[PDB]
Symmetry: none
Subunit: 246 residues, 2 copies
Amino acid sequence: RKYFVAANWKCNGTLESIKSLTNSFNNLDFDPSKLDVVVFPVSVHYDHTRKLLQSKFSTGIQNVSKFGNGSYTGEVSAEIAKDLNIEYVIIGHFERRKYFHETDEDVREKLQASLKNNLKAVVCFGESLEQREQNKTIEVITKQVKAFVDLIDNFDNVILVYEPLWAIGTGKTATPEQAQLVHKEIRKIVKDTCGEKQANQIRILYGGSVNTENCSSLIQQEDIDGFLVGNASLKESFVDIIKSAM
Amino acid sequence: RKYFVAANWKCNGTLESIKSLTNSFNNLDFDPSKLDVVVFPVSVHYDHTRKLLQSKFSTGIQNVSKFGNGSYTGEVSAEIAKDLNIEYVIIGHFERRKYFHETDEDVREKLQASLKNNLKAVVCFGESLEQREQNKTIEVITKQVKAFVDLIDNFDNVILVYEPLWAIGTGKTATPEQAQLVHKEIRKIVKDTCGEKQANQIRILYGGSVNTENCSSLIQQEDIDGFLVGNASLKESFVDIIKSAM
């Protein structure tokens, strides 16, 4: 399957810092028909970023509404995103589940809205440190995936992201062994509930303190198809992470 | 006085599990001149642990011999510990008094040997459930402390640990009120036998099923200066217990 590398800039950037960063990104020579590279800038930065980035790079937004067009002040609907030809959306990111009270119900409704409007979605899930120490990792992960897996119709348009909460922006990356185990179990869940062909074509990425030093060993794992990169994507060295996947 | 938090790994660990654990511990940003944090790995794990742990963490061993260098197969003398620059030693832990037949006499001789070799010691004592139900708590505790208190010359180098036997690894922690009462009586014993200045500078920790949920309320007590943590110290969440003391 095609490897996938996503840059989640989260809530960072200025018009100038983005110009400098996109410049470095554009210098990397890579074939978009062999590797997917998506950049997710802040909403108000979308037009600026899409313009500066070369067409080989795909772009998207960090969140989308579970509602349609209407009286929902502050939200961006899937219909609006499609009108702008925004290709991807991130759904269920830990930070939205944590600081904001997004639940599995919100995740499934947002995915349904996205697929309905032909948007490609990057869906995140993962267990907290407390759940891991209680050995509930697989139980929690299974519940989270089952909350929306039946909605997936085209397995090339939905990308799964295993995000252990304890590894997000902390510097404590999951070891290749740890991640591989979880990814293998996730694909088995998909295989058994959706089908083997489907399971083998869906990308399952790892997210959580991925950097230029550990990316190579992680992507080498049989069931890790790429990554969702946070803080490391705000640096010019991010290009080396992309290189590890080509 | 400076709070003190001790991680007693007891008889647990593998080279790999220690690498993962020390990694999480190293991520906690804390000032060692404001808080003492000591880790006690198994003897054969000492070098490995000392190397992996950052210098902000102090280390020690779980037991020391009451004899000096010589024909005592299986023992580690205080002289040997000092040669290795091992900073702390635990003395009189319930498990050594119980499974092994260490008595108050052994506790005092081991402390004398430790202080003689400039080692800092964490001395444990506490009453059994049977003694508590007979209302002999203070009587038993007083006898145990009096067995070695005259040997203390530097009150910053000896740390006392009130370990109610019924609270060790059982999950039944002493309530803040219970512990506070006992700690207050212990400090009064020291005050009256050694002096007020001495009594006010010596750390008296509580040990017995301390976890991330109850640590805050315990450390808040006026005479509880920290803890000796067992099972909860084998988990990455141990960092939250350290946080409660900073």
